[PDB]
């Protein structure tokens, strides 16, 4: 019958690894680096675009940084089309929680549900896993500012600072060196850019190569503001920190 042609995407290796999770993690290793840094007064998301062309329309472009609601954003590393499927699920789940409880979804509950969807594709269905890793940047009134990461396995963990995609090993060492706990958003902005500036496989790091965002409780009257930086603003913060 059709059995002949089944890859069997949901089995263990004799070492007790899920092949297809591991080969997806391999795929995501070649993706543009995304860095998340959590401070006391906010969270930074920076990410490196993979396709440099002078003719790509940058200001209308989104491959790395998406918004799930008014308090929660993700930075993508992997197949952008796969990430867009999961992003639309996350967007609905936050709005089903809001319709049911009349409260904005706590960050962890959203991340566990995405991570539970990813887990599903590794244990049943015989489909390929989602070739995606997310950094989650979010705020809620229980734990305040939160970073999490998810990966094709459906494992998620929380971080003070984290990277995904290419050169995470190098990226994670550099963060571990310079990151302190009493740190502020302005410093975390400078750390995030400097770390991409060292790990990048490109000759130099320029505004046309980056997506950048912040989540600050530095909105008027103790509210929370998500700022996806426009290309001009990225080029400004690149001069300010002293990288260009």
């Amino acid at each position: 019958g059709s059995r002949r042609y089944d890859s069997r995407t949901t089995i263990f290796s004799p070492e007790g690894r899920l092949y297809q999770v591991e080969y997806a993690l391999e795929s995501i290793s070649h993706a543009g680096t995304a860095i998340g840094i959590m401070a006391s007064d906010g969270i930074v998301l920076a990410a490196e675009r993979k396709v440099t062309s002078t003719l790509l329309e940058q200001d209308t472009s989104t491959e790395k940084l998406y918004k799930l609601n008014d308090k929660i954003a993700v930075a993508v590393a992997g197949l952008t089309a796969d990430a867009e499927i999961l992003i639309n699920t996350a967007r609905i789940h936050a709005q089903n929680y809001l319709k049911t409880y009349n409260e904005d979804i706590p960050v962890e509950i959203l991340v566990r549900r995405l991570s539970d969807i990813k887990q599903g594709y590794t244990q049943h269905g015989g489909l390929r896993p989602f070739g995606v890793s997310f950094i989650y940047a979010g705020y809620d009134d229980r734990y305040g500012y939160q970073l999490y990461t998810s990966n094709p396995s459906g494992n998620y963990t929380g971080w003070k600072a984290i990277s995904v995609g290419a050169n995470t090993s190098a990226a994670q060492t550099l963060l571990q060196m310079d990151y302190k706990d009493d740190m502020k958003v302005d410093d975390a902005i400078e750390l995030a850019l400097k770390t991409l500036s060292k790990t990048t496989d490109s000759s130099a790091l320029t505004y046309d190569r980056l997506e950048f965002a912040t989540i600050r409780k530095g909105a008027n009257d103790g509210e929370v503001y998500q700022k996806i930086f426009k290309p001009q603003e990225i080029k400004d913060i690149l001069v300010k920190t002293g990288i260009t």
Partner: protein, 250 residues
């Protein structure tokens, strides 16, 4: 139907490549050249009508398709795959948008729905990816003019100008020289026609070239008067004659 193929036919290989997406992108390359250029006041999409027989009436095969009054598509790769994606793209503009909001979707969102259709053919049971890259040019009130590329993976990207298929590497270099942010639509049709002559071996006239625009509103093309807010389709296929006129001044 005993469709037992409920498992993916696109899987990660040990290097992290998705084989069937890569092979689909190889089918796109072997495909005839198509290109799109975005002007300040419009967008142009252009391709060659590679006729399979001189007994064929190449007018009956359209490579450039209207999706909504304000959105247009062209491709490189397997035509029949493009045809069913056109059928699906037109319908989804209605079912998931027009029947809800009473207007047509903006360019990005219709692109987003096509992307999604193709991402599914990359992960669902018992199907191969689509063997096409689309260029989609449109207008909408709040985003203005836009040009989008959609790849077999589901991935789409906004372009000022680009090319896909056979001589796309050469064509893309040509465009990078000739493009600025002060181009008028007539300047963009001129650069489109120049660029497409480099990748065309044989006859180069209005009968072997298919070129369409997203320009001003054409109230004359509407077919009815007495509704001040419907001002007419922005999508227009240039005629065999209109092309030849521009080739004399080339």
């Amino acid at each position: 139907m005993t469709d037992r193929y409920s498992f993916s036919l696109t899987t990660f290989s040990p290097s992290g490549k998705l084989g069937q997406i890569d092979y689909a992108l190889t089918a796109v390359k072997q495909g005839v050249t198509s290109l799109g250029i975005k002007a300040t006041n419009g967008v142009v999409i252009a391709t060659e009508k590679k006729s399979s027989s001189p007994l064929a009436m190449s007018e009956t095969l359209s490579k450039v398709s209207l999706l909504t009054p304000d959105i247009g598509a062209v491709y490189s790769g397997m035509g029949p795959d493009y045809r069913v994606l056109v059928d699906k793209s037109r319908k989804v503009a209605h079912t998931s948008y027009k029947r809800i909001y009473g207007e047509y979707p903006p360019t990005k969102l219709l692109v987003s729905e096509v992307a999604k259709i193709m991402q599914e053919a990359t992960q669902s049971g018992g199907v191969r990816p689509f063997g096409v890259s689309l260029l989609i040019a449109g207008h909408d009130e709040f985003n203005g003019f836009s040009l989008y590329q959609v790849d077999p993976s589901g991935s789409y990207f906004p372009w000022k100008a680009t090319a896909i298929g056979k001589g796309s590497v050469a064509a893309k270099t040509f465009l990078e020289k000739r493009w600025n942010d002060e181009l008028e639509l007539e300047d963009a049709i001129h650069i489109a026609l120049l660029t497409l002559k480099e990748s065309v071996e044989g006859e180069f006239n209005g009968d072997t070239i298919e070129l369409a625009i997203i320009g001003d509103e054409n109230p004359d093309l509407l077919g009815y008067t007495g509704i001040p807010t419907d001002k007419g389709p922005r999508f227009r296929k240039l005629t065999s004659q209109e092309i030849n006129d521009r080739l004399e001044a080339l």
